[PDB]
Design a protein around this ligand. Structure first.
Ligand SMILES: COc1ccc(Br)cc1S(=O)(=O)Nc1cc(Cl)cc(C(=O)O)c1O
Length: 308
């Protein structure tokens, strides 16, 4: 009577191409409430787009140099952005206004995230530090001497008690948010992306040898390896697709979006259409929708939808 769905490949297909950025796109993120897509770019702008119809909503401006990353608060009302101007900015998405500018990094800010409570922001920089910021006061709470090369990614776990960071130094580290102290170091190719898994027990890490790995960070054991894409140069995001079939999703330097079966590690789809490196992908929180974004020969975001 009641059965698990019969597994089938997904059928993501291009629905919309979102044009308007004038330099490379650097990140795309769906709002937690599913209504919006935010994009950031080397053109110093953030743009907001409808998640279901791709329709342009607004441009948010104020950074003085290019932006590498943007991230949503849990209530979908705020964004934080990380810029080459050495700052982060907190934005009210409804008004487009900059609420706070977070100063303290001494070089490009590359990555950022709110914690799920969204009272904190974590950032990673070319200055080799991770900073933890108070959203309400806009002040830095802690500076972690996290790495010995630029920090490529930072992510909180579900209850915000842990931060995972990655770096070109070849390390992934797990930090205690409350104290800022290191809990674990996983180890030497540059690590270009990392995030916690949906069950909170694993980390998904990209390295610049064309490889994604799923690690049990407590045990220090690699559970799965995903290959077939191209990744030797850029920090390319990777995602867990949790709405339908269990997939891993990533961009690639051969201009494709790759989708793998989580368990078997087989490639189940490659999405064709971009004309430069796909630097960022995002998975919609409740529907089978992927956003992808590309570098400066392309400069567009594409929205892809699957029936399962
Ligand atoms: C509930 O967790 C997940 C849900 C969706 C995705 Br996509 C990934 C995870 S996970 O946190 O990565 N856990 C996980 C890891 C592996 Cl290798 C296999 C399985 C499996 O169900 O066969 C699995 O659940």
């Amino acid at each position: 009577t009641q059965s698990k769905p019969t597994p089938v490949k997904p059928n993501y297909a291009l629905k919309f191409t979102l044009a308007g950025h004038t330099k490379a796109v650097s990140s795309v993120k769906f709002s937690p409430n599913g209504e919006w897509l935010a994009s950031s770019s080397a053109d110093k702008l953030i743009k907001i787009w409808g998640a279901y119809d791709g329709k342009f909503e607004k441009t948010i401006s104020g950074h003085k140099l290019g932006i590498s990353d943007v991230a949503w608060s849990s209530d979908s009302n705020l964004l934080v952005s990380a810029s080459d101007d050495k700052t982060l900015k907190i934005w009210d998405v409804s008004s487009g206004k900059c609420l706070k500018t977070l100063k303290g990094h001494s070089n490009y800010v590359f990555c950022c995230n709110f914690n799920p409570q969204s009272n904190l922001i974590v950032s990673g920089s070319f200055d080799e530090s991770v900073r933890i910021w108070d959203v309400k006061t806009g002040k830095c709470l802690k500076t972690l001497p996290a790495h010995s090369d630029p920090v490529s990614a930072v992510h909180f776990n579900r209850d915000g008690s842990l931060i995972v960071s990655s770096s070109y130094d070849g390390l992934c580290r797990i930090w205690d948010t409350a104290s800022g102290q290191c809990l674990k170091t996983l180890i030497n190719p540059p690590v270009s992306f990392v995030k916690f898994s949906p069950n909170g027990k694993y980390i998904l890490a990209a390295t610049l040898d064309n490889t994604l790995k799923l690690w049990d960070y407590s045990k220090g054991k690699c559970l799965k390896t995903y290959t077939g894409h191209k990744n030797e140069k850029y920090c390319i995001f990777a995602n867990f697709s949790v709405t339908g079939g269990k997939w891993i999703v990533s961009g690639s330097e051969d201009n494709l979006v790759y989708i793998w079966n989580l368990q078997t590690k087989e490639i189940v789809q490659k999405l064709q259409g971009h004309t430069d490196v796909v630097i960022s992908t995002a998975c919609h929180p409740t529907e089978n929708i992927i956003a992808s974004a590309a570098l400066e020969n392309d400069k567009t975001i594409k929205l892809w939808k699957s029936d399962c």
